[PDB]
Amino acid sequence: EGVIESNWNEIVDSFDDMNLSESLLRGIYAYGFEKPSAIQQRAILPCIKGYDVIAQAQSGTGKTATFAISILQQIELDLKATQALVLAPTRELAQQIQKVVMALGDYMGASCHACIVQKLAPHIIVGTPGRVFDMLNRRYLSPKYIKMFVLDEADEMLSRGFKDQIYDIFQKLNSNTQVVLLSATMPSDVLEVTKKFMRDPIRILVKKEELTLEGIRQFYINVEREEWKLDTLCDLYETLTITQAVIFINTRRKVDWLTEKMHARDFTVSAMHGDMDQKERDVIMREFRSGSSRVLITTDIDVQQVSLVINYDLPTNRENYIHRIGRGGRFGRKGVAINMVTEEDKRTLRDIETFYNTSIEEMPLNVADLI
Amino acid sequence: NSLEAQIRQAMKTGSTLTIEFDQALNQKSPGTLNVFLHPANGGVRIDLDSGNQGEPAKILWLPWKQGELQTLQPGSISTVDMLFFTYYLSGSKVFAGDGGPVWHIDAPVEANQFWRRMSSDEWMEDWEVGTDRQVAYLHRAGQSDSLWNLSAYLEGAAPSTYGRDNLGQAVVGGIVTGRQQMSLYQYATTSSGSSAWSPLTYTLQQRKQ
């Protein structure tokens, strides 16, 4: 799910027309192997030609034959040295790679060892970054004939803190080393690795939405009229047990208004808006994180946990809706959001689920026994 | 005199010295990172800007990342006296293995979930069921047990905590003392202001599964 964006057009959907060697194909057909993904279908060819490649492949590509093929087709089978080096974030992923690489490899007489002792020079080495850096360091492996460096799941590896080890390993490799990075995610630092290590590489990216609504319970209250919002907001603090909350407001004027009325009801509050510099926000975020204020009121945030988010004002568009309550990452997919709805909102937006493209349900009475 | 020495000093002597971090740091993966330390209020700001009386430094950095765990690998812990920092704890947790990794876990990530993601790490795979490791663990007090209680997975002293009633912030830091060896420190920021630095202790923990 998503859409491919490439700077290179060179597709192949079969093992048949990849210009592979015979012993490789003997291996491919021997073990009925799967078809390659759309991503892989456009990476495999320039990859075989030795070009630098950035492929936004889904996690687990290391298990597949196309992955193995991209490595085996480049190996001088008669040179008895390590020519390819694959880094994976964990033992299980390295073993999966080792398994499929050595399966196909056997028909070709290629060797593949997974670094995860005395025996150590196989053509291909796959393993964890630290373990692998260590082996180069203690000279049990040689970067001398290594012409290919694969970073499978670069994102996972950076997340698991192997950036250091990865940069140190790179410094030991020849200048003409083909780099192939695979990552389902392309955050800033992953992009940096490629800028640092690659020369005009093939780019096969997938534009992916970074914030998501997944697992966030979304409610709305028919407040009907603007002037009944303050009361509605105060009743929520009597219906629910709220530790800290973020209240989004559309204008600086109302931010100031709401913090005055809220403060008059003995809420500790922090107000923030666009006509404030970064040094003034910092002090305000400092007070919210510390819990000196139980309520943060802003316009269109640096904090890890809050009881819920309240859209006191409905956001002007979907992008804003997602920047307000959407969360990044695969885990900790929980949250509670409450939207306040007036008749004018309903008359303008027509249908909020459609307008904001998500599932928002009317806040029930038993809401406290639900979130 | 150098901002790096003063922090190191404040941590060891148990003095009060607050740390500010640029959100931009969280775009930098866990590892060895060159930063600039600047005086800010009576504390120190850490960022990537060379100006405003910025003194360079080389530290061990560990970012925060929403919906995820970030990890600092033991193989990075080697230069004696190097400082270590992780982004502000405002609900999140920090788990540290002695001779092992440091994990910054996002707040709502359930304990069952992050434990499973941690176990994937090499150091955890070597931690045989039925044996011990030394662990420094810190969560916000009053937070729901679903987000941090690891009693089904470990037998040992209770984790350290910060704040009260799931309110408060913490700043975790360190000083490398040797190869895969680091002294951890913490200070809290609540409605009473900021406390002084105190050791973040490692206790013995037995792996139950």
Author numbering:
A (entry chain B): 20 to 135, 144 to 147, 151 to 330, 336 to 406
B (entry chain A): 3 to 211
Article, verbatim:
Burkholderia pseudomallei lethal factor 1 (BLF1) exhibits site-specific glutamine deamidase activity against the eukaryotic RNA helicase, eIF4A, thereby blocking mammalian protein synthesis. B. pseudomallei Burkholderia Lethal Factor 1 (BLF1) is a member of the CNF1-like deamidase toxin family which acts by targeting the site-specific deamidation of Gln339 of the eukaryotic initiation factor 4 A (eIF4A). eIF4A is a member of the DEAD-box superfamily and is an essential component in the translation initiation complex, supplying RNA helicase activity responsible for melting the secondary structures present in mRNA prior to translation. A mechanistic similarity between catalysis by the cysteine proteases and the glutamine deamidase activity of BLF1 and CNF1 has previously been suggested given the similar orientation of a Cys-His dyad in their respective active sites.
Comparison of forms A and B further reveals a shift in the position of the target Gln339 in eIF4A with respect to the Cys/Ser-His pair in the BLF1 active site. Whilst in form A the orientation of Gln339 is consistent with the suggested involvement of these residues in the mechanism and the expected nucleophilic attack on the side-chain amide of Gln339 by Cys94, in form B it is not. We suggest that the orientation of Gln339 in form B represents a non-productive mode of binding and the following description will therefore focus on the interaction between BLF1 C94S and eIF4A seen in form A. A total surface area of 1900 Å2 is buried in the formation of the complex by the interaction of two patches of residues on the surface of BLF1 with opposing faces of the N- and C-terminal domains of eIF4A across a wide groove between the two domains of the helicase (14 and 28 residues of BLF1 with 14 and 20 residues on the domains of eIF4A, burying 700 and 1200 Å2 surface area, respectively).
